[PDB]
Amino acid sequence: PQITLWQRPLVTVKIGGQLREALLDTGADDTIFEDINLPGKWTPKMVGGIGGFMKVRQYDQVVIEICGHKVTSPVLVGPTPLNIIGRNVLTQLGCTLNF
Amino acid sequence: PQITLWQRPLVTVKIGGQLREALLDTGADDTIFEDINLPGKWTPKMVGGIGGFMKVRQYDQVVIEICGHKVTSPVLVGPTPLNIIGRNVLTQLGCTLNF
Ligand SMILES: CC(C)CN(C[C@@H](O)[C@H](Cc1ccccc1)NC(=O)O[C@H]1CO[C@H]2OCC[C@H]21)S(=O)(=O)c1ccc(N)cc1
Ligand SMILES: [Cl-]
Ligand SMILES: [Cl-]
């Protein structure tokens, strides 16, 4: 799969049984979702961004079905404007930037 | 050039005669710098991010030297935490996401 960038690189994901859309985001260290409810215990973290910070929940060892790949990662949950797939998951898909 | 994602995809760039480090950011629609001053008139714009919004200046037709390439693009200047290269400049590099 080669994906150009004339449009936002959005992919469909299955995460914790739910169907979501998310953004392939090389500028994100960590994968974060807004519109989901994950099972289990969590750890309080924070994420900093272009315009400020926000409290999040880190859920460890979460199954994500993305492109043809099935992967586990810690997932942050909080009020991001869009679901984002970050370098912790991108690296596991063997994702690379080419030019 | 093929770049993995185990570390932040940071690149050196010459922009408006100044040397900067910036992030290849497929999750960013637009290109934005924090630690520069560009010449000329500008248009007030805003950007929204993970944690909120901020006011920025859009400078049109700015020359950026990024890896081997020399391109023009509108550039946003404002209080971002890092410099980011977004899809408006990535497309001009013929940059793709591969896996
Ligand atoms: C969140 C996206 C929808 C958009 N963001 C681009 C994104 O890549 C930022 C880019 C970014 C990077 C560092 C600091 C601020 C913004 N990364 C980010 O928020 O990542 C957070 C999640 O993991 C951590 O990794 C880096 C910060 C954490 S954004 O910075 O807010 C943004 C929004 C609009 C434009 N034009 C350009 C950038
Ligand atoms: Cl994991
Ligand atoms: Cl231009």
Side-chain angles (χ1 to χ4, degrees):
Chain A
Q2 189 166 223
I3 300 165
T4 54
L5 287 173
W6 305 98
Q7 297 302 339
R8 291 189 174 167
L10 293 155
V11 290
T12 317
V13 316
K14 195 185 203 180
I15 179 172
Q18 303 155 246
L19 308 170
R20 282 312 179 275
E21 194 149 55
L23 187 69
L24 300 189
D25 192 348
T26 67
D29 291 357
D30 302 302
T31 293
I32 167 151
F33 279 79
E34 145 211 71
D35 42 16
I36 59 164
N37 281 318
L38 288 182
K41 58 180 155 190
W42 55 268
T43 307
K45 305 267 179 169
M46 210 150 299
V47 309
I50 217 161
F53 80 88
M54 65 176 192
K55 306 172 206 197
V56 296
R57 304 181 167 207
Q58 176 169 329
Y59 289 90
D60 286 357
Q61 214 162 73
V62 181
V63 145
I64 305 183
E65 289 188 41
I66 183 172
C67 317
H69 284 58
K70 212 175 156 50
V71 286
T72 31
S73 185
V75 180
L76 309 184
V77 182
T80 184
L82 269 154
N83 306 322
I84 55 173
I85 302 300
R87 296 184 300 94
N88 55 354
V89 156
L90 290 176
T91 52
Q92 294 195 81
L93 309 175
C95 295
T96 195
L97 286 165
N98 296 59
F99 60 105
Chain B
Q2 183 172 60
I3 301 155
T4 54
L5 283 171
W6 302 99
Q7 298 287 329
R8 306 197 187 171
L10 280 149
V11 290
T12 310
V13 321
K14 196 173 178 181
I15 182 164
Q18 310 169 241
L19 311 171
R20 284 312 180 261
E21 190 132 66
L23 187 74
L24 302 187
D25 200 340
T26 66
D29 286 356
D30 301 301
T31 294
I32 168 162
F33 287 73
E34 139 218 87
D35 41 10
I36 58 166
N37 289 308
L38 290 168
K41 61 188 160 190
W42 54 270
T43 293
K45 277 186 161 77
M46 279 160 89
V47 295
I50 219 162
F53 274 80
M54 70 177 183
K55 305 170 197 185
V56 296
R57 307 182 171 203
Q58 171 170 330
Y59 287 88
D60 292 357
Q61 222 162 75
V62 181
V63 130
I64 312 186
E65 276 166 44
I66 177 171
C67 284
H69 289 64
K70 204 169 153 58
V71 284
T72 42
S73 175
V75 178
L76 305 169
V77 174
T80 186
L82 277 162
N83 299 332
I84 63 193
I85 306 297
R87 303 182 293 92
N88 52 345
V89 158
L90 296 177
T91 50
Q92 299 193 82
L93 304 178
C95 187
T96 62
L97 280 164
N98 304 66
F99 58 96

